[PDB]
Design a protein around this ligand. Structure first.
Ligand SMILES: C[C@H](C#Cc1cccc(C(=O)NCC[C@@H](c2ccccc2)c2ccc(OC(F)(F)F)cc2)c1)N(O)C(N)=O
Ligand SMILES: C[C@H](C#Cc1cccc(C(=O)NCC[C@@H](c2ccccc2)c2ccc(OC(F)(F)F)cc2)c1)N(O)C(N)=O
Lengths: 319, 319
């Protein structure tokens, strides 16, 4: 599929709070579709979808999420709780004069668009998530306890204390992104026992090979983006589990009634497809896509499949 | 009508050439409507139309024209010929992924949108001009000669030599804009015999009163905008008459066939309504509005009337 060159894009900026402005890239005309990337990514993670969606007749707004890229990265950890992040995205729509938008997210952006649909359905025309399932909060089980009962989420405890994971991820950015952005069959990093091994990359090469999914030029773009604000803002998305849990609990007796799509990825070994298995009981109008041979980095692993799934669903359920 | 606060707007930037980026403000969803201001104005001259058009179901893109505001102001005079300006606006649409837009202009922006419709009709869904008529080039009469046969366009000869009008318009910006932005019954400046009187403001108060059309805060916004690049870029729009005439002559045997609207203003003593009188012979699908008691500064003189005319025409002929 056709990709984006960053300097041939229209760049938009919206101030949603005194020291917080959101940056986005904008392409096409038609119904507004807002794309929300995950950790640790960029608007550029949507590079294969932006031209394709615009060509299909949508107005694509591909965000730099708060903490990333050209968006502001306030220093405070609580600025990255889901409650604040969602209300800023509503303000974003307000300042653009958009009554509604389709929201499509991946990874942490998938979590965000689910909560947008849950708490601001009147502002969400339709919602789609790649990899990230929607699991309603259990008001009887705290979040950090649910993380210890699952060993693959152990890197999340390593991410908790400010400054620790930042030093490792920032020490060599090219190594960081070449180590992360890999197909499942190429994966080089261990998510289990990160805390007993000292860090996330201790048992990965100092000069890793380039994944089949990405070019050297595409890696260097992410590198350039993360030189701006570093990893603190991105990591802060993980540092609000108790507040996110308390907020999510305030919604418990309610369903998501708007058109919705869940896209699972066969080889995402962290956000595994089985984690989505009873989403229908909460989301009555939920539709599904599923991508075989697809790892965690869904948009760049299987861009053609992603594009086909999204455009078919947009054309029937969002338009 | 509701106006705009500049800090609650979404701001967009598009690079159309190596050292030229266009700034615009963006509000609403629906068909793309691009608003092009005149001399010496700003996107903010559309402040009463932007919320109203967006509320009526349009996606408003209100430009800072090249040379103004947050848009680039390259130094070269030939960068502001109509030929270059229009091709940049096509590039603008290209980079936004817009196949077409409605173009609405006033004053020099009215001239620009007429030439967009003439040379790039496939990119103009519909075209509207406030005050500025469309008069096809006379290939037998040079432009500076046509200006001497009309005494009201004598300030245009004063505008020709670089640096001269700049010194007068820049010497006190608040005085400049308070002197210009006035109703016809309040007008304080003489357009005739500017060159024999030495300048444009020689016979106007050093501390002029504030027009009924504008507040002190609105004046100071223009003042702040013109501190950025000064008047050279704006004045350069007048310094390309021979090239604009040669380019316009290349189109001579052709009509404008797209939906079109000409809005005349009873009390614009420079762009007088009579100047539009045989536009129908060139623009077969031309419709008309006419605003009584309206001077040159149409959008802020009669904003409610302008809004009503534009929305009625957009809803029938552009949508
Ligand atoms: C509320 C709270 C939560 C949450 C939550 C929600 C969405 C996403 C994430 C998340 O961590 N995304 C990063 C995954 C990424 C990664 C991992 C480590 C470091 C950097 C990047 C990765 C990379 C390769 C890979 O390949 C494979 F699959 F491993 F082979 C898989 C994943 C966390 N909570 O407690 C519960 N229960 O939701
Ligand atoms: C191709 C070439 C051309 C052209 C062209 C096209 C469109 C617009 C203009 C233009 O000059 N716009 C500025 C008017 C403005 C002004 C005047 C002087 C200084 C600053 C601002 C003004 C202010 C108050 C006012 O009030 C009233 F009506 F006077 F009472 C009227 C006008 C020139 N050409 O040779 C021919 N023939 O088109």
């Amino acid at each position: 599929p056709t990709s984006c060159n960053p300097s041939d894009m229209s760049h938009g900026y919206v101030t949603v709070k005194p020291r917080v402005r959101l940056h986005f890239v904008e392409l096409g005309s038609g119904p507004a579709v807002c794309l929300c990337h995950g950790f640790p990514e960029s608007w550029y993670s949507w590079r294969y979808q932006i031209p394709a969606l615009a060509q299909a007749g949508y107005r694509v707004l591909a965000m730099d999420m708060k903490g990333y890229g050209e968006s502001s990265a306030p220093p405070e950890i609580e600025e990255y709780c889901m409650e604040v992040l969602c209300k800023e995205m509503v303000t974003f729509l307000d300042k653009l004069g958009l009554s509604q938008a389709v929201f499509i997210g991946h990874d942490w952006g998938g979590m965000l668009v689910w909560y947008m649909a849950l708490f601001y359905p009147e502002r969400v025309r339709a919602v789609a998530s790649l990899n990230t399932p929607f699991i309603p909060a259990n008001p009887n089980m705290s979040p950090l306890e649910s993380i210890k009962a699952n060993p693959v989420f152990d890197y999340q405890l390593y991410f908790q204390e400010p400054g620790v994971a930042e030093a490792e991820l920032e020490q060599n950015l090219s190594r960081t992104f070449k180590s992360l952005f890999r197909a499942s069959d190429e994966s080089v990093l261990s998510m289990h026992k990160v805390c007993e091994a000292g860090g996330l990359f201790v048992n990965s090469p100092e000069e890793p090979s380039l994944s089949r999914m990405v070019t050297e030029e595409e890696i260097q773009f992410y590198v350039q983006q993360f030189k701006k604000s570093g990893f603190r803002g991105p990591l802060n998305w993980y540092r609000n589990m108790e507040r996110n849990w308390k907020w999510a609990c305030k919604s418990l007796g309610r369903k998501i009634l708007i058109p919705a799509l869940m896209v699972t990825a066969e080889k995402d070994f962290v956000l595994v497809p089985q984690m989505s298995q009873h989403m229908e009981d909460w989301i009555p109008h939920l539709k599904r896509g599923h991508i075989e041979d697809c790892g965690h980095w869904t948009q760049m692993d299987k861009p053609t499949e992603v594009n086909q799934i999204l455009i078919k669903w947009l054309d029937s359920d969002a338009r």
